[PDB]
Design a protein around this ligand. Structure first.
Ligand SMILES: CC(=O)N[C@@H]1[C@@H](O)[C@H](O[C@@H]2O[C@H](CO)[C@@H](O[C@@H]3O[C@H](CO)[C@@H](O[C@@H]4O[C@H](CO)[C@@H](O)[C@H](O)[C@H]4NC(C)=O)[C@H](O)[C@H]3NC(C)=O)[C@H](O)[C@H]2NC(C)=O)[C@@H](CO)O[C@@H]1O
Length: 129
């Protein structure tokens, strides 16, 4: 599914992402936009054999099992395929686990690049959330 920006903002707010581990909602909408253009089916293969999956582009070296990644740890304890559904439940559950590690939201390259230190008001403007 390709989510609409406010549609995604509502689903994230409903799921307790607003303020999760101290990260306000706009943070999550901004990273989703730059990581996947709001597409739950987005996939990106890396030079290292890993692949990034879903709306949050979660990497198969550490978080999920895709059966073809060298030295994979599967910390979320899921199949990477579960990160590509229209339903965001599993992706959200795994994103919540990722941000608890020491690097926090800095785990996401797109966040470090396009969202960190920026004015993110625009990402939730007009959503009424
Ligand atoms: C630019 C590019 O090629 N790639 C990006 C890709 O980097 C993004 O995926 C990110 O990959 C990085 C690099 O592998 C991941 O960071 C590692 O994350 C693990 C897990 O948190 C860290 O190990 C943790 O280390 C802490 C501190 O020592 C320990 O407390 C924990 O025990 C250990 N946890 C476990 C469970 O092993 C490791 O240190 C990180 N490495 C570095 C150098 O920071 C990052 O998690 C990952 N992000 C996501 C969202 O999957 C990816 C997404 O932006 O896109 C591009 O492909």
């Amino acid at each position: 599914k390709v989510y609409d920006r406010c549609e995604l903002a509502r689903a994230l707010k409903a799921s307790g992402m607003d303020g999760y581990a101290g990260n306000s909602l706009p943070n999550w909408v901004c990273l989703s936009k730059w990581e996947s253009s709001y597409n739950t089916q987005a996939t990106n293969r890396n030079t290292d054999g890993s692949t990034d999956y879903g709306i949050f582009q979660i990497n198969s070296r550490y978080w999920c099992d895709d059966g073809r990644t060298p030295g994979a740890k599967n910390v979320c304890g899921i199949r990477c395929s579960q990160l590509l559904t229209d339903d965001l439940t599993v992706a959200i559950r795994c994103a919540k686990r990722v941000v608890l590690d020491p690097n926090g939201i800095g785990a996401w390259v797109a966040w470090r690049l396009h969202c960190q230190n920026q004015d993110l008001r625009s990402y939730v403007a007009g959503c009424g959330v």
